[PDB]
Structure 1
């Protein structure tokens, strides 16, 4: 049992479905606003992941144009949502903050 922590998770699953990037085949990290830290982390991704990212965005911008979504079966499931960028961006912010700390002394 973890009754609260699965309703606090079920709101999230609800929100995710309401956000609807998954309708356009997208993953959460595909929708992030590209600032310097993000642009850096996109830069640091390995070939396979970067290539997969570009395709998703192309397919998303394609549908967004024809004003469509994917069939239901082919949407991104909340569970199957690979948070592939987070560790890269975590490292870039961690690096930046060390700079910002060194700039203080």
Structure 2
């Protein structure tokens, strides 16, 4: 219902990866699937993800965050990878079940 939806928004501001300018999928741990996905990213979307991180890293090193006005907002967060990933995973799931 509109609970999980008002919950998710909270948690999102809670994790606070926005304070660093990082999109939801910027903080993803890079296992084999993700790796694969990231390689399928359109030239730009990747060069962009890149900056964001090299910038976040620069922050964590300085110990500071972004001024309030530059933070990502729960609804303006672009899940630029989620689709490519579910495909990688979908693809893999196949190869696996087919080898029997």
TM-score normalised by L of structure 1? 0.92
Partner of 1:6: 2
> Gapped runs of 5+ residues in structure 1?
none
Take 1:94 and 1:62, find their aligned partners in 2: how far apart are those partners?
35
Partner of 1:18: 14
> Gapped runs of 5+ residues in structure 2?
none
Q: What's the C-alpha RMSD, in Å, of the aligned pairs?
A: 0.8
**SS at 1:84's partner residue?**
coil
Take 2:88 and 2:21, find their aligned partners in 1: how far apart are those partners?
27
Take 2:73 and 2:9, find their aligned partners in 1: how far apart are those partners?
9
Shift of 1:9: 1.0
Partner of 1:92: 88
Shift of 1:86: 0.7
Partner of 2:55: 59
**Largest Rg, 1 or 2:** 1
